[PDB]
Ligand binder design. Structure first.
Ligand SMILES: Cc1cc2nc3c(=O)[nH]c(=O)nc-3n(C[C@H](O)[C@H](O)[C@H](O)COP(=O)(O)O)c2cc1C
Ligand SMILES: COCCOC(=O)/C(=N\O)C(C)=O
Length: 363
């Protein structure tokens, strides 16, 4: 028996298998409005009782750092998302909307009035990283504006309102993007967070922002409709921590406490790992062992590694990114151990509604 096809109860959601669509920015949501193409794309990948997580979705006009990423902060965005959610639900899938603020990982071209991006810090991402521009070239990350605690509470309210909007659009839940060097990770990581106020310094202070974001969306829509994604050991966009395991465990501690205080469990904790392998595996297993709830692992998984993760108790669910780009029927291919299609990096972030998006073939 393939352990990826044993059913799993993710809170109130009965999943038929453990293969999850990882959240992936694809830049087809032209001018930040969800498009019919997104409906075709997610419908292609939906399975009865399968769990899907959307591309990162803007919570406010200042939250974007990629072209043509969808928002969920306007009524028009909610209206267009509803159409996509309806077609996904008609295939029997569960779908969560990932709420995403990029913080300092942006550019004047993505900001209203060309304003500076916001962050925990005034320090820019270093020169070894470059941002994809709307014309397909790569540009320099600018200096961000470090926000005060009043503005922090406004961003928290943006997460809260976007979570309510996601439920209005029919989403089963939301995922907080707290990974990969974006805004929340810019508070978590001591390689970024140089604050001297109550949001910087100690582990507890660096965890304050993610705790307040999660608390706000839990209060708005319920813990069982909230998943949280973090990546303590991934240093994307200069997001290094001096002790990734300690940071990860501090986050897990706060999530366990939110659950006790709310009297209910989160939908899940979702952790991406970098790709020795043994040290990374032990870090992941330690986070899983410490967290009181459902654990989704992600990052470089294959059919074999996903089977092993569930069989060994290292994870409850396994999310796949790049192979799901090029294999719309990845779930069926994993079930049959069928050959997988190659994915084309060149069309990860282009705008065509078909080419490199919905034209990868089925079996
Ligand atoms: C094109 C692309 C877009 C991605 N966009 C997001 C995103 O919007 N939010 C997020 O949390 N992770 C994003 N990721 C990371 C994936 O969710 C996932 O963790 C990674 O692809 C898993 O590794 P795998 O591709 O080997 O399966 C993206 C990855 C790719 C390749
Ligand atoms: C492909 O990069 C691996 C980690 O994923 C990211 O950093 C990400 N979003 O989290 C985007 C939009 O790419």
């Amino acid at each position: 028996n393939n352990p990826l096809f044993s059913p799993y109860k993710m809170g109130k959601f009965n999943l038929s298998h453990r293969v999850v669509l990882a959240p992936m920015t694809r830049c087809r949501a032209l001018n930040n409005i969800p498009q019919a193409a997104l409906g075709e794309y997610y419908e292609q990948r939906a399975t009865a009782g399968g769990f899907l997580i959307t591309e990162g979705t803007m919570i406010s006009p200042t939250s974007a750092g990629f072209p043509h990423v969808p928002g969920i902060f306007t009524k028009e965005q909610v209206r267009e998302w509803k159409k996509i959610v309806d077609v996904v639900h008609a295939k029997g899938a569960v779908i969560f909307c990932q709420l995403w603020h990029v913080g300092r990982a942006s550019h004047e071209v993505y900001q209203p009035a060309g304003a500076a991006p916001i962050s925990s810090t005034e320090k820019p991402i270093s020169n070894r990283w470059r941002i994809l521009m709307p014309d397909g070239t790569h540009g320099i990350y600018p200096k961000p504006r470090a926000i005060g605690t009043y503005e922090i509470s406004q961003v928290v309210e943006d997460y809260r309102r976007s979570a309510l909007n996601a439920i209005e659009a029919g989403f089963d839940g939301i995922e907080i993007h707290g990974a990969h060097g974006f805004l929340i990770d810019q508070f978590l990581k001591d390689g970024i967070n140089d604050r001297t106020d109550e949001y910087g310094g100690s582990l507890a202070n660096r965890c304050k922002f993610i705790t307040q974001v999660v608390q706000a969306v839990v209060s708005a829509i319920g813990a069982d409709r909230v998943g949280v994604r973090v990546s303590p050991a991934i240093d994307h966009l200069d997001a290094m921590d001096s002790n990734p395991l300690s940071l990860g465990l501090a986050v897990v501690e706060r999530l366990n406490k939110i659950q006790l205080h709310s009297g209910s469990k989160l939908a899940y904790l979702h952790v991406t790992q970098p790709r020795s392998e043994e040290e990374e595996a032990r870090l992941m297993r330690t986070l899983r062992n410490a967290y009181q709830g459902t654990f989704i692992c992600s990052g470089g998984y294959t059919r074999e590694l996903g089977i092993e993760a569930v069989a060994q108790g290292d994870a409850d669910l396994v999310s796949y990114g790049r192979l799901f780009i090029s294999n719309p029927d990845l779930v069926m291919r994993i079930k049959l151990n069928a050959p997988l299609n190659k994915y084309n990096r060149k069309t990860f972030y282009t705008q065509d509604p078909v080419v490199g998006y919905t034209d990868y073939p089925f079996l």
